[PDB]
Write a protein that binds this ligand. Structure first.
Ligand SMILES: O=S(=O)(O)C[C@H]1O[C@](O)(CO)[C@@H](O)[C@@H]1O
Ligand SMILES: O=S(=O)(O)C[C@H]1O[C@](O)(CO)[C@@H](O)[C@@H]1O
Ligand SMILES: O=S(=O)(O)C[C@H]1O[C@](O)(CO)[C@@H](O)[C@@H]1O
Ligand SMILES: O=S(=O)(O)C[C@H]1O[C@](O)(CO)[C@@H](O)[C@@H]1O
Lengths: 416, 413, 425, 406
């Protein structure tokens, strides 16, 4: 009919900032002596879940952004995060970080690559605040990543180890490798050591440009030690929180945004990006809508699909649509194609209608196939890190990345 | 009195910038850029110099990003010249000087090769389709012959065939290496270019200059020991003056503040000596070389006691001083730096700016009357961007990248 | 839609919507305004030569007088002292010696002694309409009365309700109309109607503009590979061979005039933008055909003969006939590049704009004698063949002012509404 | 429609570029004793010597140029301050000789109107922060308070002999008007309210009492008891100088704006009388004789006497149009400003020989002593780019150029 304009309007960006403050305030209750706890549906700590590395590292990242946004108390949460990464979570005998601890000791002693890449992101985002211990934490995290999680032999990321780093898992994961790309982008932004961007491009070339593109942009996540897909992985456990059977369309559209951050990093240094970053980001965006948007007679993104693109887990988890909104912004920024803003607007309307929770705080984690609140895949409201991708990313250029851009004063730079 | 970051001052700067861009256009010759005389006509006897051709490529890259019609054509002409008669097809790199008949000076001058690197890196910011290929080639030549991994410093020069390197190491060539490396960093975001820049500055400024009351030693032997008496018999050399060249001291200061700004832009604490030594160089330049002989202006050279030797006021030292005043003001907010900038602007319009014949005079005598002694014509406009465009831009990224990124007047109201 | 003639680029050099480029444009605009001021004569605006002197032998043309009224309306809204006096002079000339007191409308040409050419030229009357509508944006107290009069003349003699198209010309007495229908007159009708719409919001002006474009572009031009047919008989059938014996005509060249093709493109994008400004989805053929015209203009007329520049005319196979580089075609091309960039965000249109700007300063701009050359030979050296002097500055606002403004409302309205550099940083 | 110029960046860019043309013309006036008298080709007329009023005005002009970021301007401020501390300065009796040259004193008289320009020049120079400016202002204030501001009359005196032994048996609107102009800027660089109190008092006597009661025809010539001399001279034209009427209007609006800037309700008569003066100036002096332009003087019936179009009256009219527009938002004031700009480029501006003509005949053709002033031109070139408070030099120094423009 005509173009309703939200992107780069101060009116929309004011609404985003005020929702951002609501989300920052919800996450503050997660402070526990050993790091950040697991928030439930009323913003209370679920003490039985203990202190997870992935949640502690994500909150360190989140409050780095909040601190650069000039929020009192955020810097204290960054300081608390860095103390936790130097304290109870840190394995003093073998190095790196336990997956989960509590006041009594270690709950899960395993060394999870997924969670270590979030440690790297958290440390790199914390660097943007100039916290005096942030750069030392990043340098240590880099040594752990290069010793145990980045393989020079495979030129890809490993998945996990036992406590003692004696045996690595006979498995390679798209999820851990995707969050490696995310962390590497920010490590690049705070080092300009080229190898971080080279590693990110290489990971995307293998998982997206080779495997995903050849399967109609259905991202394969599960691989053996020779980087062959395991198509049947977790067939008996399809609703796994991190390793769902088949395809996780939320992850496809997230890969898209990350490859546009890579594209934008190359353009920021006056370098023509390879054409496949934008072509594949478009392919992933359109595949996500083709297979996973309202495929079953109601609005929303399903959690998982088979290799034919037919839904398996039909629950609407929060993070897939949040990532979709981030990618819509990134594609709009690089194409000026108004279809991407229309999707962003449609998804915002769905989010306030079904996911946003003004009564109990933050957003619901999970809805059923009719978009009614449920508990099946998940349990509580333990994450706010994804929400910055629909609340803060649309206020920033695509280079440098989220925490660096906010710290460089770039919030609303393109808005009038 | 407020000039820095005012649109009124920056409008005056842009209008003078257009006058300078217009003057340089007449330097176009088939083999690159010629040597302009005092009326902006080509001095054909000087032929086509690599340093002038590379500098004009840089200048018209900035002009093109400023939206000036014709500038991009000059960028195109510059890149063709760097792929044409100046390029040594047998041994690689570039001849120092050519003309329409062939090679005039076949030597491989590091000073001039670092300007080739700056020119190629600035040209990349225009997106000219051959710029990146020229930069990649220039990088290979620099890393093969001019950056020494053994010394972690820049060599000076070679014969045509790259068979023997000069038994000499130079502050001047190493300073213009730092200048080029900053822009290579801005168009690669490969930290090794900034690591090299920091290392060069640590040796020439933080070690030697600081220990001599910030009187920069420029002349070294192959083991990086100072030759204090170098060119005693030829004190007014255009590139290697006897003793200290205070214009170079204050220029080193600005370059170290660009390095500082690059490190802060990626959330890295710059070493404290970049700002401390930039201040030391700025104050030493004023102490020894500003009105040291009973009249305003910066002398060309001083002895190791800081007393003038060549008392002629060459154009580029005061232009560089004005750039450094801006950079120090930007990092300190100390209004003494703006006072110096304003005082130097008043001197420049009174004695150096030439509205009748175009551009600025290259050289004045000890009473600030136009002269010919050290120099001959108006062959440079590259230095003028440091007092005309730099004060309109942040210190990171560098000049050509910042203009191309839309940052002109970003801090002004 | 991709044309030959650009080397692909490694990064985006940004000029459009930069205050640095727009400052360069404004300073060139002031140089052009200053050149036109010497054209003031008692009966209107004279014909300026290569040194900015009046060529008195050419007398006072309606088309030049009406164009200068339009130009100084823009200058007046830009806050230039003296411009409003030239608008006042223009309106007095349109109410004085040029005006036919017996039959109405305006003589084509007068001088201090009387009428030189008494004919009633539609081409020139549509410039009278544009001039009056642009003058309205200044609020000159006689402008609205001049527009109302001009509208009456246009609706009586030049817009045909029967054909739903514009007629070409009449004798002095409006007794017989020319056995000819012209793309050129109809194109400048569209241009004028856009501005009449902007100062009336009487829908019929935009309806008439859309209708004219639907016939000359969407029907005839599109079916001939976007080679605009300009010459028609009274039944609107093409006369393909028109002026075969007089191929270098200043207004009615034999075959196709690619400058006019790319100009049609920009006008259709002003029409598109007028519809979007009132929250109405424009028909898709306005943008599709503007792209077709832009790419056809480059295909047939850009550097077809071993040197840069736009040739004046091509035959129906796209073979150049008049190879001289006249000023206005590349100026219009630059305007259309801006309009297409604004609606597509396709950087190929900015690259063409930048390439054409580089050509203009190299070969057309005349800093020594003033303004720009009117005409170059096939090697881009100054010549005299099609034209004679520097009688026009109206086209130059399309590459100097249009790139500083939104596409709606039109040129004079947008400047008067404070929109200069609204999108620039 | 309204054609919009005021507060548009497009118009203000045209104004700044003309301002630079005017700054460049004045630079040739530098002589060792101060600022010389420029002729019609921008050459020094050496026979005219160094006038106090011209030297003080150029000090003011290059203070504005220096705050505008023009290289060379600050050197001219420094030169101006040195001239006010050198040969112009009476070392024996204090204040400044009216005219000197390289050899010595040409006119030793102590002219009030020229001393108030010395005060304006010193106050404008203070806004540059030149280290000798404040000392020059403090000295100038002492001379003004000793000899030119009368605590007894609460008005300004006109002139004295060299030795300050006898004051002239005359009181003038012109000296008192330029006192108001200087006092406004002294207020802006001291925030001592007494300068604004004195300005309001001067205006209350010359405008609110006498001018208002005579249909806003300002009486300029008074005896020592401040009674009008209507017949005087059957700088001191017989009858009314309408240029001065409209100038008084702008100055009272600067006074109004200074009071509003410190949250003080200005008396209603400042705006009412500025409007009265503006409309009286149009009524009697705009195109009163069959051709465009402002005549120089009129009789007490408002009929022209001296029909020459001098440059400064229309320049001041343009300043007042801006000030009235700023306080009323009445577009009639912008229409007058636009009409006067069109007249100025057509008849006064001289692109061939530089600057503007000083004087035209009754048919607006140039007529027959040079182009010795550029100070008035800032009132139509810079004032329309600034708020009405603080005043011209302070506002530019505070970064307020184009603050209201888009
Ligand atoms: O954010 S949570 O929803 O609590 C955890 C999810 O983050 C992802 O890696 C998405 O990229 C999922 O695999 C996790 O379940
Ligand atoms: O620019 S010129 O004056 O032509 C040359 C000077 O540039 C410098 O390297 C300064 O950075 C001098 O040594 C050259 O003479
Ligand atoms: O502007 S001029 O070159 O003098 C006249 C041209 O304008 C056109 O109508 C193009 O739109 C041509 O037909 C005229 O020759
Ligand atoms: O500026 S000049 O025209 O040279 C001098 C005039 O200034 C006034 O004081 C106007 O306010 C007049 O009395 C002078 O003649």
């Amino acid at each position: 009919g005509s173009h309703m304009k939200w992107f780069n309007t101060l009116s929309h960006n004011r609404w985003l900032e005020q929702e951002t403050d609501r989300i920052f305030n919800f996450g503050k209750n997660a402070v526990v002596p050993t790091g950040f706890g697991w928030l439930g549906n009323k913003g209370q700590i679920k003490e039985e879940m203990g202190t997870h590395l992935w949640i502690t590292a994500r909150m360190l990242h989140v409050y780095s952004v909040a601190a650069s946004m000039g929020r009192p108390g955020a810097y204290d949460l960054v300081d608390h995060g860095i103390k936790a990464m130097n304290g109870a979570l840190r394995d003093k005998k073998y190095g790196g970080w336990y997956a989960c601890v509590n006041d009594q000791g270690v709950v899960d002693a395993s060394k999870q690559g997924y969670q270590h890449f979030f440690a790297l992101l958290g440390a790199a985002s914390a660097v943007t605040t100039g916290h005096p211990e942030a750069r030392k934490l990043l340098d240590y995290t880099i040594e752990v990543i290069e010793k145990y999680f980045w393989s020079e032999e495979e030129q890809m990321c490993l998945e996990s180890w036992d406590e003692a780093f004696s045996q690595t898992e006979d498995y390679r994961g798209g999820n851990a490798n995707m969050h490696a790309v995310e962390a590497f982008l920010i490590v690049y932004d705070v080092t300009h050591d080229k190898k971080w961007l080279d590693r990110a491009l290489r990971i995307a070339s293998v998982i997206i440009h080779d495997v995903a593109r050849n399967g109609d942009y259905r991202v394969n996540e599960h691989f053996d030690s020779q980087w062959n897909p395991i198509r049947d992985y977790n067939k008996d456990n399809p609703a796994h929180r991190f390793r769902a059977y088949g395809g996780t369309p939320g992850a496809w559209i997230e890969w898209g945004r990350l490859m546009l951050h890579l594209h934008a990093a190359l353009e920021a240094r006056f370098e023509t990006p390879p054409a496949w970053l934008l072509e594949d980001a478009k392919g992933l965006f359109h595949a996500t809508i083709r297979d996973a948007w309202a495929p079953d007679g109601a609005d929303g993104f399903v959690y998982s699909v088979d290799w034919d693109g037919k839904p398996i887990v039909r629950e609407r988890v929060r993070w897939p649509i949040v990532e979709a909104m981030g990618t819509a912004y990134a594609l709009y920024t690089l194409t000026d194609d108004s279809q991407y803003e229309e999707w962003y607007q449609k998804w915002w309307d769905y989010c306030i209608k079904y996911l946003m929770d003004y009564e109990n705080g933050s957003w619901w984690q999970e809805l059923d196939a009719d978009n009614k609140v449920t508990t099946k895949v998940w349990d509580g409201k333990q994450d706010i890190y994804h929400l910055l991708h629909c609340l803060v990313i649309p206020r920033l250029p695509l280079a440098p990345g989220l925490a660096p851009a906010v710290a460089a004063g770039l919030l609303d730079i393109n808005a009038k």
